[PDB]
A paper describes a structure:
(A) Close‐ups showing the colored density map of the partly processed foot structure of the pre‐5S rotation‐lacking Utp30/ITS2 state. Superimposed models of the pre‐5S rotation state (Arx1/Nog2 state) indicating the missing parts: Utp30, ITS2, the C‐terminal part of Nop15 (aa277‐335), and Nop53 (aa85‐107). However, the two events, 5S RNP rotation and ITS2 processing, are not strictly coupled. On the other hand, we observed partial or complete removal of the foot structure in particles prior to 5S rRNA rotation and in the absence of a tightly bound rixosome indicating that C2 cleavage and trimming can occur to some extent even before the rixosome could interact with the pre‐60S and trigger 5S RNP rotation. This could mean that there is no strict sequential order of these events, but that also branching and parallel maturation pathways are possible in principle.
The rixosome defined in Schizosaccharomyces pombe and humans performs diverse roles in pre‐ribosomal RNA processing and gene silencing. Here, we isolate and describe the conserved rixosome from Chaetomium thermophilum, which consists of two sub‐modules, the sphere‐like Rix1‐Ipi3‐Ipi1 and the butterfly‐like Las1‐Grc3 complex, connected by a flexible linker. The Rix1 complex of the rixosome utilizes Sda1 as landing platform on nucleoplasmic pre‐60S particles to wedge between the 5S rRNA tip and L1‐stalk, thereby facilitating the 180° rotation of the immature 5S RNP towards its mature conformation. Upon rixosome positioning, the other sub‐module with Las1 endonuclease and Grc3 polynucleotide‐kinase can reach a strategic position at the pre‐60S foot to cleave and 5′ phosphorylate the nearby ITS2 pre‐rRNA.
Residue numbers in the entry:
A (entry chain LB): 2 to 98
B (entry chain CH): 357 to 477, 482 to 509
C (entry chain LB): 197 to 390
D (entry chain CQ): 1 to 113
E (entry chain Cb): 2 to 102
F (entry chain CO): 2 to 43
G (entry chain CN): 1 to 246
H (entry chain LV): 5 to 139
Write the structure that this text describes.
C-alpha cells in the first residue's frame, strides 16, 4: 500500500556511483564553447589549495539589506605558481567524437 | 458628561502656555523663495528618483554616499580613509590638536634622553654563578641516581 | 608554439571579480554507514541489529535490492565540479603587502602567523576565492572559465576588501603580526635574558 | 571597521573573533575567545586570574602612567575628514608606538633590577 | 552542594551578576526594576525576606538571619568589598579612555 | 514559481547575457588576451 | 505643508526619518522614493543625509537632535559617525553618547528650546543633552508613557501628543514647553505620534494612512500653510473633529 | 497577509515548538508557550522553530486569566541560542522573550521591558517605537 507521509528521497541520484574518483587530479569534462571572433585565450589553470581565512568586504549590492555595509566572509586561498607551457595537442571531429 | 464625550472634549481642547509667550521659530529665508514642486512642470527640479530611473531603476542604481560631503578640499571627497594601521585604530588617534601633543612628547623624549632615562649599564660573580650552576647539576645527577635505585 | 617553454602566470588567465569554476577531488572519508553517507534517520535506541541503518531496504517487488536504496560504502574522494566562485583578489608573490588593503595599511603577506596549518607559507601568486572549494589542503585545484555568460549581478559586482585576517589558525589567534603580538605582550623574561 | 578589546582578558578582538553576551540591563560583553567566555559564565574574576590584563594592571606589572598612553581614546565627537590630518596621524602613530616600546622596556628593567 | 551541577553553566540557569548586585546596593531604583521583573506571589516568603548581596529570596526572617551566618554570604561580602569587575576597569586595564570633548 | 527551465526565464536570461554581462566579459577577455599575447611575443 | 509619505509601504515615517530645522536624516533604502519626498519638500534648503545607525535602518528612533546638535547612541560605528560629520556643516555639533537607554529617538524629544526625556536617563546624559542641544531638560511622561520621543511630535510652533492625554496634563506640559499642545492621532487612529510622523517649523511628513481630519489637526497645531493656527481646532474644525473622533 | 516578514536574513533558530519564553511587554501575560511558527516549511518529523524577529503563535501559561483562553500572535525579541549577524558577530541574550502583537504587527501592550534585538526592531516598526534599548 501507499506511503502514508510523503518525504523526498535521501541524496541525489545525479552523483552516482559514490565511488572513489578514478584519478587524483580533477578532470575538466567540458571546456567553454569556442568562438573564433574572440581573441585567443587559455581556458583553465592549476593551483594548490593552501587554506582558508576571513575578510571584511565593503558591500555594494543595491537592493540587499547589507548594502553599503561591512560583511564578514570566508575565503579560500589557492597558491598559484606560474605554469610552464610544454606542448600542443590537436583534435579533429569524427562521427565517433 | 460620558466617557466618550469627555474623550472628544480632550481631543478638541487646545492647551496654551499660561504666560502667553511664544517660542521663537527658526525658518530659513529660502523657504519663502522656494517654488513648489509639480510633477507636470517641464522645468521641475530633477529628483534622486528621476536619476535612479534614468540609471537602471531601483535595485540596480548605486547611490553615491560621498556626493554631498562638505570637506575643506573637494578633491578629498573620494579618498580611501585609513582605519587600521599596525594593529591600532586610526580613529582612536584622530585628534585636531595632534601636533602640539606630539611636540610635547618629543620635548619630553629629548629631556629624558638628556637626563639619562634610557641609559644601560664582575668576573668573581660570574665565576661563583658558574660554580653554583655546576653544584646544581651535581645535585640533579645525585637525585637521578636515587630515583633510579 | 609561441608559448612553448614559457611561464604563464595566473593573472594572465583570470582576473579579479571574475566568477570561475573549481574542479577537484573531495575529502576522503573511507567506508561510511548510511546515516552519514546518505543522511538517513537513526532508528530508536537499542534497536536490534543496530540503529545506524535503514530498517527496510526492500518491502516490495522486485525480489531484489534496488539501486536507489541507501547502502554503506565509500564516502568522499569524489570528483566534483563546483561553479560560480567569485575571485576576490589575485595577489602577487613578489608583493610584500599582498594582504594589505586601502583602509588597512599594515604591510603583511597572506600567510597567517605560524603558517598555514599543514601547508606552509604562500610565497607565490595566490587566488582568493569567496566561499569554499571541493578539495583539501595541499590538493591540486583546476580553475576553469565559466561555460556560459553569467546571469547574476554578483558576477558583475566589483569587490572592495577592507581587511584580510592573518592571525594564527593554529588556535585562537588575536594578533595579525608578530610585531603586534610583541607590542601587546610587552617585554618577556627571555628578552632581558638575551 | 575597528579593533575591539576583550572584556575579560583585554586581548585585541578582531572581526568574527569571539562572542558577545547581551545582558537584559542593556550592557554588551565582547569576548575574544571561548576561554574568556566560559570563565565569565563560571563567574571567575579577571582581576584574580593572573593571565589577564586586569590582573596585570591591578598588580602593577603594566606601564599605565605614561604620556604615550594618552593618544588613544574613544572619540565621541567626530572630526571632519582631512587628508593631511590623517597622514600626520599615521606618522604620529608610528612614532608613539616606538616611544612606547622604549619606555615599556625601561619599565620592565626597573621591575627586574 | 550545587543542585544539578551538570547544567550549572546553561544560560537558563544563570544567576545575577556581581556588578548588577553592586548597582542594586548603590541605587534602590535598579533593585526595584529587578524586583518588578519578578512575581511576588511565586517568590519564597512572598518576597518579604531578600538578601541583596546574594540576590536571594528566603522563606522566613529566621532563614535569612541564619543564611547571614554562612560562608556563601561572607564570600559575597568579601567579593563586594574587593569590588566588581566592570567595563571601566576593563578600559583602565588596557589604558583606554573615553573622550567626550 | 517559474522553473529554472521555464521559457520566459530562459528568454530573460538571454536578454541579460546579450545586453549586460556580455560587454563586461568581452572587455575582460580583451585585457586578459592582451596580457597573454604580451607574454607570448616576449 | 503636511505631506503624506511611505517608507517601503510603511506608514511609520518617524521610525525612518529625523527632521530638524537645520538638517534631515533618512534611512538608506532599496530605492530613492523616500529620499525624493523630502528632497521635493526641501529643495536644498537644509541638507538631507542617507544614514545608517548600528547597521540598522531605524534611524528616527535611534537618533535625537534639533537645529543645534545631533546625538547618536553608543553602538554607532566610526564610519557612520564620519559620514554624518562629513555630511553636516560645522554649525551642528554631533556627539555619540554612552546612554544605557540607547533608543535616543524614543527617550528624547526636543525642539530648539527645550527637551523632554525618559525619567531614568543618566545625569551625565542629561548634562550632555543640555550642552550639545543647547536646551533646558525636564523629566516627563505623556499618559504614563516614558518613551516621550515616540509618543509626542514637537516643534517650535507647537506639539501633538498622545490622544489619551488628560486636559490637565496637556495644560501642565504646555506651561512647561511654552508651545500650544493638542492631543490627536496619526495613521488612522494610532497613538504612536513620534513613530508616525516628523515635523519641523515649516514641514510635517506623516504616513499615508493619516486621515484628512487628523491631518488638518496637525496643520493647525504646527502652523503649516497660510492661515494655520491652533484656534481652528476649537473654533473652525470643532464639528469635523467631534464627528470624526466620537 | 500572513505574518512571516520579508527581507530577513538567515539566522540560527533557537526556539522550537513547545518552548516557554518570557513575556517582555505589559499586556498582563508573564510567559508565552509556542505552539506554531509563521512561515515554517514542511519536513518529516522536524519541529517548527523560530528566532529573533519571527512571528509565532503562543498561548499564555502564566498571567491574567483573560489572556489564558486565546492563541495570540507574538514576535520573538530575545533568544539565548547564539547566532551570527552579517558583520560577523556571534551574539546571544540571557533569556528568550517575545511580545504579543496583532497580525498587522502592532503591539498589544504599551511598553517593552528590557532590550530587543536588531532583527525584531528592523522588521517590526511598532516594536522599534516601543523599544527602550536596541542591541
Ligand atoms: Zn579574551
Ligand atoms: Zn546573603
Amino acid at each position: 500500500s501507499h506511503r502514508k507521509y510523503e518525504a523526498p528521497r535521501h541524496g541525489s541520484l545525479a552523483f552516482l556511483p559514490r565511488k572513489r574518483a578514478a584519478r587524483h587530479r580533477g578532470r575538466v569534462k567540458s571546456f567553454p564553447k569556442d568562438d573564433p571572433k574572440k581573441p585567443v585565450h587559455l581556458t583553465a589553470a592549476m593551483g594548490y589549495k593552501a587554506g582558508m581565512t576571513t575578510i571584511v568586504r565593503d558591500l555594494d549590492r543595491p537592493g540587499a539589506k547589507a548594502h553599503k555595509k561591512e560583511v564578514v566572509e570566508a575565503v579560500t586561498i589557492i597558491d598559484c605558481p606560474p605554469m610552464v607551457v610544454v606542448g600542443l595537442v590537436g583534435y579533429i571531429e569524427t562521427p565517433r567524437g | 458628561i460620558g466617557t466618550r464625550l469627555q474623550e472628544v472634549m480632550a481631543r478638541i481642547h487646545v492647551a496654551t502656555p499660561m504666560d502667553g509667550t511664544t517660542r521663537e521659530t527658526f525658518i530659513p529665508e529660502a523657504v519663502k523663495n522656494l517654488k513648489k514642486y509639480d510633477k507636470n512642470d517641464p522645468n521641475r527640479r530633477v529628483l534622486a528618483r528621476d536619476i535612479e530611473e534614468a540609471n537602471g531603476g531601483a535595485g540596480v542604481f548605486n547611490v553615491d554616499l560621498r556626493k554631498d560631503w562638505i570637506l575643506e578640499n573637494p578633491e578629498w571627497k573620494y579618498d580611501k580613509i585609513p582605519e587600521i594601521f599596525d594593529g591600532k585604530n586610526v580613529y582612536d588617534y584622530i585628534d585636531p590638536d595632534i601636533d602640539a601633543k606630539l611636540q610635547a612628547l618629543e620635548e619630553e623624549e629629548e629631556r629624558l634622553e638628556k637626563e639619562g632615562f634610557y641609559d644601560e649599564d664582575d668576573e668573581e660573580e660570574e665565576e661563583i654563578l658558574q660554580k653554583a650552576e655546576y653544584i646544581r647539576e651535581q645535585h640533579a645527577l645525585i637525585r637521578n641516581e636515587a630515583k633510579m635505585r | 608554439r609561441s608559448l612553448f617553454e614559457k611561464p604563464v602566470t595566473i593573472d594572465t588567465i583570470f582576473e579579479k571579480d571574475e566568477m570561475i569554476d573549481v574542479i577537484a577531488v573531495t575529502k576522503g572519508h573511507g567506508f561510511v554507514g548510511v546515516t552519514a553517507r546518505w543522511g538517513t534517520k537513526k532508528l530508536p535506541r537499542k534497536t536490534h541489529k543496530g540503529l545506524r541503518k535503514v530498517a527496510c531496504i526492500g518491502a516490495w517487488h522486485p525480489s531484489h535490492v534496488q539501486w536507489t536504496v541507501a547502502r554503506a560504502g565509500q564516502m568522499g574522494y569524489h570528483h566534483r565540479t563546483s561553479v560560480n566562485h567569485k575571485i576576490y583578489r589575485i595577489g602577487k608573490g613578489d608583493d610584500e603587502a599582498n594582504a594589505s588593503t586601502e583602509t588597512d595599511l599594515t604591510k603583511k603577506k597572506i600567510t597567517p602567523m605560524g603558517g598555514f596549518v599543514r601547508y606552509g607559507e604562500v610565497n607565490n601568486d595566490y587566488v582568493m576565492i569567496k566561499g569554499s572549494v571541493p578539495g583539501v589542503k595541499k590538493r591540486i585545484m583546476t580553475l576553469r572559465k565559466s561555460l556560459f555568460t553569467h546571469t547574476s549581478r554578483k558576477a558583475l559586482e566589483k569587490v572592495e576588501l577592507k581587511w584580510i585576517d592573518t592571525s594564527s589558525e593554529f588556535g585562537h589567534g588575536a594578533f595579525q603580526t608578530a610585531a603586534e603580538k610583541k607590542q601587546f605582550m610587552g617585554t618577556l623574561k627571555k628578552d632581558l635574558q638575551t | 571597521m575597528r579593533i575591539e578589546n576583550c572584556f575579560f582578558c583585554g586581548r585585541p578582538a578582531w572581526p568574527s573573533k569571539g562572542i558577545t553576551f547581551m545582558r537584559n540591563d542593556g550592557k554588551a560583553f565582547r569576548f575574544c575567545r571561548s576561554k574568556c567566555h566560559k570563565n565569565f559564565k563560571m563567574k571567575r574574576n579577571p582581576r584574580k586570574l593572573k593571565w589577564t590584563k586586569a590582573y596585570r594592571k591591578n598588580a602593577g606589572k603594566e606601564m599605565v602612567v605614561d604620556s604615550t598612553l594618552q593618544f588613544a581614546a574613544r572619540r565621541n565627537v567626530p572630526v571632519r575628514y582631512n587628508r593631511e590630518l590623517w597622514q600626520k596621524t599615521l606618522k604620529a602613530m608610528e612614532r608613539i608606538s616606538e616611544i612606547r616600546a622604549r619606555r615599556e622596556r625601561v619599565f620592565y628593567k626597573k621591575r627586574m633590577a | 552542594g550545587v543542585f544539578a551541577k551538570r547544567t550549572m553553566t546553561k544560560t537558563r540557569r544563570r544567576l545575577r551578576d556581581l556588578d548588577q548586585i553592586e548597582r542594586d546596593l548603590r541605587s534602590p531604583r535598579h533593585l526595584q526594576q529587578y524586583k518588578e521583573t519578578k512575581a511576588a506571589e511565586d517568590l519564597p516568603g512572598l518576597g518579604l525576606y531578600y538578601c541583596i548581596e546574594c540576590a536571594k529570596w528566603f522563606e522566613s526572617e529566621t532563614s535569612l538571619v541564619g543564611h547571614r551566618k554562612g560562608k556563601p554570604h561572607k564570600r559575597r561580602l568579601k567579593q563586594l568589598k574587593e569590588g566588581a569587575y566592570t567595563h571601566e576597569e576593563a578600559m583602565a586595564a588596557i589604558g583606554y579612555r573615553i573622550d567626550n570633548g | 514559481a517559474k522553473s529554472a527551465r521555464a521559457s520566459r526565464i530562459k528568454e530573460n536570461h538571454q536578454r541579460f547575457k546579450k545586453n549586460i554581462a556580455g560587454p563586461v566579459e568581452a572587455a575582460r577577455l580583451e585585457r586578459l588576451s592582451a596580457k597573454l599575447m604580451a607574454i607570448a611575443q616576449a | 505643508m503636511a505631506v503624506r509619505a511611505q517608507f517601503e509601504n510603511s506608514n511609520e515615517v518617524g521610525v525612518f526619518a529625523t527632521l530638524t530645522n537645520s538638517y534631515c536624516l533618512v534611512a538608506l533604502g532599496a530605492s530613492e522614493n523616500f529620499y525624493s519626498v523630502f528632497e521635493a519638500e526641501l529643495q536644498d534648503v537644509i541638507p538631507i543625509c542617507r544614514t545608517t545607525i548600528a547597521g540598522t535602518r531605524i534611524i528616527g528612533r535611534l537618533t535625537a537632535g534639533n537645529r543645534k546638535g545631533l546625538l547618536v547612541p553608543t553602538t554607532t560605528t566610526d564610519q557612520e559617525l564620519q559620514h554624518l560629520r562629513n555630511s553636516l556643516p560645522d554649525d551642528i555639533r554631533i556627539q555619540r553618547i554612552e546612554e544605557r537607554l540607547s533608543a535616543l529617538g524614543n527617550v528624547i524629544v526636543c525642539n530648539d528650546h527645550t527637551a523632554l526625556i525618559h525619567p531614568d536617563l543618566e545625569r551625565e546624559t542629561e548634562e550632555i543633552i543640555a550642552d550639545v542641544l543647547g536646551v533646558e531638560v525636564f523629566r516627563q511622561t505623556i499618559a504614563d508613557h516614558v518613551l516621550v520621543g515616540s509618543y509626542m511630535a514637537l516643534s517650535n510652533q507647537g506639539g501633538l501628543v498622545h490622544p489619551k492625554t488628560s486636559i490637565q496634563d496637556q495644560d501642565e506640559l504646555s506651561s512647561l514647553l511654552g508651545v500650544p499642545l493638542v492631543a490627536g492621532s496619526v495613521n488612522r487612529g494610532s497613538n504612536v505620534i513620534g513613530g508616525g510622523m516628523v515635523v519641523n517649523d515649516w514641514l510635517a511628513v506623516t504616513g499615508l494612512d493619516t486621515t484628512a481630519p487628523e491631518l488638518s489637526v496637525i496643520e493647525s497645531v504646527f502652523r503649516l500653510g497660510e492661515g494655520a493656527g491652533p484656534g481652528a481646532i476649537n473654533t473652525s474644525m470643532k464639528n469635523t473633529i467631534v464627528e470624526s473622533f466620537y | 497577509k500572513r505574518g512571516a516578514p520579508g527581507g530577513k536574513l538567515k539566522m540560527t533558530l533557537g526556539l522550537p515548538v513547545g518552548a516557554i519564553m518570557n513575556c517582555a511587554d505589559n499586556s498582563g501575560a508573564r510567559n508565552l508557550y509556542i505552539i506554531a511558527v509563521k512561515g515554517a516549511g514542511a519536513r518529516l518529523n522536524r519541529l517548527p522553530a523560530g528566532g529573533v524577529g519571527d512571528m509565532v503563535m503562543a498561548t499564555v501559561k502564566k498571567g491574567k486569566p483573560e489572556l489564558r483562553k486565546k492563541v495570540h500572535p507574538a514576535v520573538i525579541v530575545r533568544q539565548a541560542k547564539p547566532w551570527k549577524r552579517f558583520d560577523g558577530v556571534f551574539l546571544y541574550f540571557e533569556d528568550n522573550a517575545g511580545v504579543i502583537v496583532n497580525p498587522k504587527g502592532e503591539m498589544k501592550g504599551s511598553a517593552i521591558t528590557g532590550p530587543v534585538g536588531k532583527e525584531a526592531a528592523e522588521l517590526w516598526p511598532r516594536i522599534a517605537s516601543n523599544a527602550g534599548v536596541v542591541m
